[PDB]
């Protein structure tokens, strides 16, 4: 459960990401495909080569979604409703994979936010990513 301090930490860190949200989104995906190759099973229709427009565009859509969730951190369920339905009913990504992308998104933020990535912010971001993952998989069954 996100405390108020958690919400403040996320907002602060995400704020700093700012304009690079899409570029970070793309790098996190590339880190995931390389570290955890089994995730590639869900992208057989993509050119997964480094800097592909498909990954860059997907990275952007992922970042925008995270931005929407930070914006509406007090009501994520409603905010990500549509995404929650798409993943549950169409994409059908095994829930384990959400933890692997969350890990790679945390590594990307760490690599880019030297000042802001303190232990307390790291904890808050981890929890935030876990909440987003829970909302995304909440309509699976």
């Amino acid at each position: 459960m996100l405390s108020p301090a958690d919400k403040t930490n996320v907002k602060a860190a995400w704020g700093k990401v700012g304009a690079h949200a899409g570029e970070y989104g793309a790098e996190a995906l590339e880190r995931m495909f390389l570290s955890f190759p089994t995730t590639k099973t869900y992208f057989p229709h993509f050119d997964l080569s480094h800097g592909s427009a498909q990954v860059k565009g997907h990275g952007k859509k992922v970042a925008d979604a995270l931005t929407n969730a930070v914006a509406h951190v007090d009501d994520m369920p409603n905010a990500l409703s549509a995404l929650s339905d798409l993943h549950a009913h169409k994409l059908r990504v095994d829930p384990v994979n959400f933890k692997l992308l969350s890990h790679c998104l945390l590594v990307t933020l760490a690599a880019h936010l030297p000042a802001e990535f303190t232990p307390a912010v790291h904890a808050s971001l981890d929890k935030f990513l876990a909440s987003v993952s829970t909302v995304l998989t909440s309509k699976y069954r």
């Binding site: 089994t38 099973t41 059908r92 095994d94 994979n97 069954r141």
Partner: protein, 146 residues
């Protein structure tokens, strides 16, 4: 896998009583019911909308029989699961695009099915022997992923 002589005998003794056709169909149908996201690999199988639909689907029963049949073969080569499943590992990765986590779910549903079928004979020690086997098999099938 490393099974004590007692685990190997437990495994083998129970498997001689398994009707692979029947257990295969039950295991695959229960996977599709309990973890419905797994239906993503079976769009051409027909009606998978309800438990009853899933369980009486002949394409499900047929596939279930194929899968457990291949699983039976690894039971004969418990000392070389990776070598036994190499070709099938590459198929599932390169052609089928199946996330290997699905192998783990099926292993757990199978355990449930043997317990349901066998009752009291599926003792804690027997289960433990089976759990090592289904993990082994799952690992053997994910081995050639890249």
């Amino acid at each position: 896998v490393h099974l004590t002589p007692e685990e190997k005998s437990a495994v083998t003794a129970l498997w001689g009583k398994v009707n692979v056709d029947e257990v295969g169909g039950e295991a695959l149908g229960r996977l599709l019911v309990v973890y419905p996201w797994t239906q993503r690999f079976f769009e051409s199988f027909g009606d998978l909308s309800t438990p009853d639909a899933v369980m009486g689907n002949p394409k499900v029963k047929a596939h279930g029989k194929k899968v457990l049949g291949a699983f039976s073969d690894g039971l004969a080569h418990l000392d070389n699961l990776k070598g036994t499943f190499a070709t099938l590992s590459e198929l599932h990765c390169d052609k089928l695009h199946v996330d290997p986590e699905n192998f783990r779910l099926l292993g757990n549903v199978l355990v449930c099915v043997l317990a349901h079928h066998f009752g009291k004979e599926f003792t804690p020690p027997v289960q433990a022997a089976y759990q090592k086997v289904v993990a082994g098999v799952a690992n053997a099938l994910a081995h050639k992923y890249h």
